[PDB]
Symmetry: C3
Subunit: 178 residues, 3 copies
């Protein structure tokens, strides 16, 4: 069954994108707004990736989900967030330990850290960064009027990892699968 | 008087933010416009910080003040500015020697370099950078309709270092003070 | 003829900007739009320079020209471009070998890589980077309603290297010339 072997090999080489020499690593930051809309920023880079952005509004950001590709080393993830005197602030937190595996068919398709913002916030500025396990970054942003639209028009056609409000997992298991 | 000791210790630990292991360093660039308004950009980072921005207008930028936190090593400050053939330009100036100490109660609360722009300028693009004495940067920007508003609504509630048009100094002395 | 010697010396020192200790290197990205307009982004930096930008529209970008100053080492040029599953994408291409010398009087005044976009594209996001042969970068952008305006109002008064739609070369030869 060479057809079957070829199918597995082809899918495996696609999971193998997580062991690239070129060290590809992606991060997505999702901002969940009070009108139900979702703003997404995606950066893809090599070796390390981070995003630094502010999310303003009278629909205000209510929650953040950060998702990293499975090539990230979770132990290197750092996050800083702001608008409490700066001069008594923590400069960052090492948030790795809070990231959960997003799994499909027992394969890790990404890592997620999700946190709600207190109602007192009309904004967050946020920087997050991670380095891959062992300049040319492209950034994408968009807004979707609902999480269902995000899922149908962005997550699903790109086969991206995701976790929705119901904690449903999205992504495609590839390692040695047909 | 343990209450007094505790007060001093608490304030000292706040000045000690200038000797952090984490190497926190801040820069503020103020742009003074012809209508009396003030635009501020603040970046806070670790180890080094720089800002690179252009200030356009029919109110035009008339002057620039750069302020660094007291953790900066003034000897590492570099600045580039533009709109004189590029191909005969200086790529940067090491401007450290022009920065004055902003002092409160004999304590350095920051370093300031201030320069007016010639009337021929309707714009400046500016990059400035400094490294601390021995990715995750958060940027903030705002505009205030007058320097008094800047002072009341930004400098004063944040206890930030500043120098106003009259050369009045702002900031809070903390090292071993109550 | 000391006047003649001085003229040559002065022009030569201007070509010598391509052998600076300070490692000045420039890149220009031109985006040619379907209405005949031209968008330009210029970054000048030291040692390495790159630009990462997206060009959106109902006039759409139709072609890209990347020009580097003659200080770039063409062997270090890398480019990434996007909107074909990310998870089966090449992260970059080393495009150096496609860059042609722009020449004036037998002197290299820059390097050009030009490519049209397929009609299927309403956008490109693009990152390009190069390192000089052996933080403080200033970026400029503008739009011109036609390539002739670009040439008269940007290329010509700045003595910049360029290649126009007819493959006509622009720039000024300086090495040991009057
Ligand atoms: Pd690596
Ligand atoms: Pd966007
Ligand atoms: Pd955006
Ligand atoms: Pd975007
Ligand atoms: Pd839809
Ligand atoms: Pd769709
Ligand atoms: Pd579920
Ligand atoms: Pd250090
Ligand atoms: Pd702003
Ligand atoms: Pd701003
Ligand atoms: Pd801002
Ligand atoms: Pd006020
Ligand atoms: Pd206020
Ligand atoms: Pd005073
Ligand atoms: Pd070098
Ligand atoms: Pd522009
Ligand atoms: Pd622009
Ligand atoms: Pd610009
Ligand atoms: Pd014209
Ligand atoms: Pd002109
Ligand atoms: Pd020609």
């Amino acid at each position: 069954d060479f057809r079957g072997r070829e199918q597995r090999l082809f899918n495996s080489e696609q999971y193998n994108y997580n062991n690239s020499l070129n060290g590809e690593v992606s991060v997505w930051v999702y901002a969940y707004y009070s009108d139900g809309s979702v703003l997404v920023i995606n950066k893809n880079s090599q070796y390390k990736v981070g995003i630094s952005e502010t999310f303003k509004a009278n629909a205000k950001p209510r929650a953040i989900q950060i998702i990293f590709s499975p090539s990230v080393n979770v132990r290197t993830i750092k996050m800083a967030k702001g608008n409490e005197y700066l001069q008594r602030s923590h400069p960052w937190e090492a948030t790795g330990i809070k990231y959960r595996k997003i799994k499909r068919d027992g394969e890790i398709v990404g890592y997620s850290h999700y946190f709600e913002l207190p109602h007192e916030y009309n904004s967050i500025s946020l920087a997050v960064s991670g380095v891959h396990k062992n300049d040319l970054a492209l950034r994408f942003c968009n807004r979707y009027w609902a999480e269902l639209e995000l899922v149908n028009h962005y997550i699903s056609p790109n086969a991206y990892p995701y976790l929705d409000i119901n904690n449903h997992s999205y992504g495609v298991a590839l390692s040695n699968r047909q």
